[PDB]
Amino acid sequence: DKYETNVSYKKLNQLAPYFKGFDGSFVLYNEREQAYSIYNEPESKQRYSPNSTYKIYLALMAFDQNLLSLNHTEQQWDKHQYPFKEWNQDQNLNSSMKYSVNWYYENLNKHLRQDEVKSYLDLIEYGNEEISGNENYWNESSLKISAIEQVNLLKNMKQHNMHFDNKAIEKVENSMTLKQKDTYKYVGKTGTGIVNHKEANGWFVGYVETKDNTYYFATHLKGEDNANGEKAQQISERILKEMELI
Numbered sequence: 109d110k111y112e113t114n115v116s117y118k119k120l121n122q123l124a125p126y127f128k129g130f131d132g133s134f135v136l137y138n139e140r141e142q143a144y145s146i147y148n149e150p151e152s153k154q155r156y157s158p159n160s161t162y163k164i165y166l167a168l169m170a171f172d173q174n175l176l177s178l179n180h181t182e183q184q185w186d187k188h189q190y191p192f193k194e195w196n197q198d199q200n201l202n203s204s205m206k207y208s209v210n211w212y213y214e215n216l217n218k219h220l221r222q223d224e225v226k227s228y229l230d231l232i233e234y235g236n237e238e239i240s241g242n243e244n245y246w247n248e249s250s251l252k253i254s255a256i257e258q259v260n261l262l263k264n265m266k267q268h269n270m271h272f273d274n275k276a277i278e279k280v281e282n283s284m285t286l287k288q289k290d291t292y293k294y295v296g297k298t299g300t301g302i303v304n305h306k307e308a309n310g311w312f313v314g315y316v317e318t319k320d321n322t323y324y325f326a327t328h329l330k331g332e333d334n335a336n337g338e339k340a341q342q343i344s345e346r347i348l349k350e351m352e353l354i
């Protein structure tokens with residue numbers, strides 16, 4: 109599925125070497141100039157399972173539904189042993205996001221009404237809005253979003269155009285804050301998805317907020333293997349340093 113937009117963008121073709129091994133895309137939005145820059149425009153419109161980057165909105169939804177309160181984000185670990193040790197304990201919003209603990213977000217979804225969620229995705233324009241596929245519709249399932257839409261949503265959230273509480277947004281933003289300096293705030297969320305037993309869907313979405321601007325971005329990777337959140341973030345970090353933002 110494909111996101112249709114005839115928005116203008118600066119071409120970022122010389123980012124191609126960063127995507128060696130991948131069908132990848134990089135979208136930047138410059139809040140002040142109100143301007144997109146894109147490596148690989150066709151790939152920037154292709155919709156893919158957002159995977160773990162969906163946790164961001166799943167969190168905003170749980171807040172809005174008073175499923176999460178500002179001083180109540182803690183969830184009990186039910187004692188199931190996972191392949192990654194960070195998951196094998198109680199979590200709060202911050203840790204759940206830092207370690208990408210799926211069960212935290214699967215509990216959030218389990219307690220939201222599918223129809224409230226459908227309504228949210230309609231409001232926020234979350235890609236194809238297909239949550240019909242399975243229970244974990246955001247994991248290599250029916251729900252798909254493009255790198256450019258990932259940027260539009262972050263921008264819309266941060267410019268308070270989503271009907272979510274400002275403190276809800278602040279909490280969610282804090283949970284994905286990777287670096288906090290005098291001169292910038294650096295926020296992001298990774299995503300990995302497996303198809304055909306290979307890491308084939310890599311996301312890193314976020315933004316850098318400086319003292320006079322905010323540069324929202326999304327990097328997406330598609331490839332035979334090693335297309336993962338970590339690689340996507342590594343690629344994004346290189347690109348962002350080279351534009352001199354991080």
Ligand SMILES: *C(=O)[C@@H](NC(=O)c1c(-c2ccccc2)noc1C)[C@@H]1N[C@@H](C(=O)O)C(C)(C)S1
Nearest residue numbers: 159160208210247248298299300301302337338
């Ligand atoms: C979100 O994307 C989560 N991903 C998965 O559950 C997942 C994986 C997977 C691949 C490799 C290792 C662990 C899980 N394959 O398909 C899916 C749907 C979690 N977030 C990821 C991230 O990149 O931030 C992980 C790798 C931490 S798991």
